[model samples]
Target: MNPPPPETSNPNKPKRQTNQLQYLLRVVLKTLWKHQFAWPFQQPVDAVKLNLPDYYKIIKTPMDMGTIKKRLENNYYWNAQECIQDFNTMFTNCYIYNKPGDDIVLMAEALEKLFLQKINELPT
Candidate 1:
């Protein structure tokens, strides 16, 4: 499928736009990782105001779990395992991100289910 047209007027824009897009995506992903891994540790005031779609963007990107671990621990004093568990929980609750039955699972089997569900939900 063709991609959406780039913002640059020149089509041969040295692919700098692609690199910038990837960089922006990584920033979004980092935010998602931060929110998901820290949600469980958040105070009630913070939890109530969390941004679920932004969380989804972050978690969907590939991440270095080691770097993510250090980030979580440095901010919240949580161990790597604890941060992992929190992300798992947030993935479980992605029904809140989209709609009911829009489960956002991470495990192999659950991911298959979620993938199927997403396809089915797509417009024909």
Candidate 2:
């Protein structure tokens, strides 16, 4: 199927805008690994160990730092068995990256579902 026409004046410009949502997940997961497990261990570790499917299972359950540690202790690779399920679902459903606010809302909803918090509004 033909993609929708380009919004830009230049037809020669790439027809599809590059999506950043996929990249954002990598960054967030990387940071989560550092905060949740790596920094405390005080040892050189592979970041790949942190990207697991099980973590997203708890990622939306409204957890504190301690809870994350406890959960991880129970299953060091709880999420390692599978990829982040929510991320794939969300990315596939919301691929519109041209508009900033749309993706933010989409991401916030995804985060709320996973984190159980109001990410739509900034803290007072």
Candidate 3:
């Protein structure tokens, strides 16, 4: 019989610090989901594309509950940076691309900056 894979362990891991940041991200993402925000699947014809990763697929707002659950469940270990990037990715693709008013963009950017600062401030 084939041997099973060995169990993993975190000898030096900062367990408490990690959980706090992860939980914060989870709450943020869930809040965005609850607010009916999501990434877009396609760029508009008149829109200028910003540089982003190839893996980023556009999805529309009013995100389905199933998708939200799947996203959360599938990405259980996402760190603070990933969470922040995900938030901006969705906001940029869905909200910013679709609605480019200066007032709206400014407000969203400000909110994002504040949220990012909090993420960085999480205990290490």
Candidate 4:
């Protein structure tokens, strides 16, 4: 049977902490959307349009800024770490589909670096 949540020590405190984490996540999303290097990741990869027929097969669970944002709007994340994982998935999918040394992927590297730096600054 389902049970009630079991948080202690002023349960409201978790709400405050979670809200702050969500705010930081939104900030990162906005920053990413404004970066030129982030363009390729702002939307789902269109294998048909890009003519990379093998892309979908390799990146089976494609993750992108738009998809993440959609999930965020739907409250799909219970913590910042979950949100961060989606970002990791997007970049990981890219690396999986293409060689890291390929110049086209440098953009992904750049944005990933920026994302890591931002998340590192989080209080915890």
Best by lDDT: 4
For candidate 4, the clash count comes to 0
lDDT of 3: 0.43
TM-scores for candidates 1 onward, in order: 0.24, 0.19, 0.40, 0.79
* Backbone clash count for every predicted candidate, in the order shown: 1, 5, 5, 0
Pick out the ten consecutive residues of candidate 2 with the lowest summed lDDT: 1-10
- Score candidate 1 by lDDT: 0.35
What C-alpha lDDT, on a 0 to 100 scale, does residue 69 get in candidate 4? 72
Which candidate number maximizes TM-score?
A: 4
Using TM-score as the yardstick, the better of models 2 and 3 is 3
* Each model's lDDT: 0.35, 0.32, 0.43, 0.73
Q: What TM-score would candidate 4 get against the native?
A: 0.79
Whole-model lDDT for model 2 versus the true structure?
A: 0.32
Candidate 1 residues 1-124, lDDT tens each?
1222212133342323233233223442244435434333222112225533354343343223333343342343223333344434444444333444432223323533443443343332
Error of 2 at 25 (Å): 13
Error of 1 at 41 (Å): 16
Model 4 misses residue 54 by how many Å?
0.8
